[PDB]
Amino acid sequence: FGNSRADMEASGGNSFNGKGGANASNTFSGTLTVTVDQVLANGNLHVVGEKQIAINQG
Amino acid sequence: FGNSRADMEASGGNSFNGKGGANASNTFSGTLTVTVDQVLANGNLHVVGEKQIAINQG
Numbered sequence: 001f002g003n004s005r006a007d008m009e010a011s012g013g014n015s016f017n018g019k020g021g022a023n024a025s026n027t028f029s030g031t032l033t034v035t036v037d038q039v040l041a042n043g044n045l046h047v048v049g050e051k052q053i054a055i056n057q058g
Numbered sequence: 059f060g061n062s063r064a065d066m067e068a069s070g071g072n073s074f075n076g077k078g079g080a081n082a083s084n085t086f087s088g089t090l091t092v093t094v095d096q097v098l099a100n101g102n103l104h105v106v107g108e109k110q111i112a113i114n115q116g
Contacts, residue, residue: 055080055081055082056080056081056082057080058080
């Protein structure tokens, strides 16, 4: 053990941090009058409708 | 990996912000006496009227 033959010192480190995420949203509010353009075999009604508003510059 | 052969660093950005809008309004308040100048086939009355006021300088 003389002459620092067995003296030793070591250190080590390892680090990892990952993360992730996502999100989506949508809202819609209004009222629209549509018209029936087809009646299906079970009585369900296909409906289509369009509202066009022009206010000033569009 | 010596001589910084694999060391690297990059950055990037992209931004966009658009917006728009319009609005219109009108108000009218008053009283006017008009005259019937036509009676339609369903009894509705076509009416026309004019009021002219001159106060001082117009």
